[PDB]
Amino acid sequence: SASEQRVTLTNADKVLYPATGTTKSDIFDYYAGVAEVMLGHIAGRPATRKRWPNGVDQPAFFEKQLALSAPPWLSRATVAHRSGTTTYPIIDSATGLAWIAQQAALEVHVPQWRFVAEPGSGELNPGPATRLVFDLDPGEGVMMAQLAEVARAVRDLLADIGLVTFPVTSGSKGLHLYTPLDEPVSSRGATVLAKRVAQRLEQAMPALVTSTMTKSLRAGKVFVDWSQNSGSKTTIAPYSLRGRTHPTVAAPRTWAELDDPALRQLSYDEVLTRIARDGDLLERLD
Fold first, then answer.
1. Which of 220, 147, 222 is nearest to 212 (CA)?
2. 8 A C-beta contact, residue 78 and residue 86
């Protein structure tokens, strides 16, 4: 079969997280374990990689274009940006995630739009936003209860327009909130909508929330970042590992989980246990 997808893991024993001894083999098994739940949320999207060839204590790089050296069987599609054109991989199979692991691409980042097959030729072109994302970034001195209250407030504003919101702890510091769209809208449109939500929240709790980056207004506030809805921006994918000291994950959570004052980021091993018990908390997102 000319279309047969195969990935060979090399250097299985290579440690990619020196703090914890987490190896390429660990990562390979992790992305295998999460494939079923992860794929639905990255399907149809251009996948930006961040790679750490010798692990998180060695230099890393983002990669967007799909190199010719990559497997020919990977799906791919082209985006025409201001300074040229970029052809990205679309990860849409378990073996694709095996390639991500083999690449030491600890991080997978995707935008909030999907490629759509053009009526005539079937050629893939960027289509509408399918969901909104908000990145809630806690400023200096902001506690969990404040960040949670701000998340619940975003959720409540969205609920007023009959939208449902899903939280995902970023694995870093952020809390991301995703909301699937009832009706399709351009990324430009999605960004205007998300901005309106953020500014409305800022009006409602200006002591606790900001909708702008302005850095002297950041302390003591949650920055409700609406800017990642831009079509040219990309956001860490749910279930992606993070290239951080520990192998934490962009982990879906329940709303009740956010009410825990001891809320913390989850490790890859915990995410696997959670999937086995509860399945995908983001089932309804995509």
1. 222
2. yes
Nearest to 128 by CA among 143, 111, 151: 111
One-character DSSP codes across 194-232: HHHHHHHHHHH-TTTEESS--GGG-TTSEEEE-GGGSTT
Annotated binding site, which residues? 50, 109, 135-137, 170-176, 225, 228, 234, 242
Residue partners of 61: CB distance under 8 A and separation at least 6: 50, 51
Annotation: binding site for substrate? 50, 109, 135-137, 170-176, 228, 234, 242
Cα distance between residue 103 and residue 155, in whole Å: 36
Nearest to 223 by CA among 199, 242, 248: 199
Short-list 231, 249, 232, CA closest to 240 = 249
- The count of other CB atoms within 10 Å of the CB of residue 66 is 21
Say if strands 209-210 and 222-225 run parallel, antiparallel, or are unpaired: parallel
Place of tokens 């999207």: 45
Expressed in Å, this structure's resolution amounts to: 1.6
| Dihedral angle over CA of 254, 176, 225, 149, nearest 10 | 20
- CA–CA separation, 126 and 118 (whole Å): 10
Q: Tokens 């940006």 label which residue?
A: 81
| Domains located in the chain, CATH noted | 1-128+267-278 (no CATH), 129-266 (3.30.70.3300)
Query: Which H or E run includes 137?
Result: strand 124-138
Q: Which residues sit in the known binding site for Mn(2+)?
A: 135, 137, 225
Residue 65 is classified by DSSP as: S
Experimental method, per PDB record: X-ray
Q: Residues in the chain, how many? A: 286
- Assess contact for 147 and 208: CB atoms under 8 A: no
Angle, alpha carbons 250-41-176 (nearest 5°): 40
- For residue 34, give the amino acid letter: V
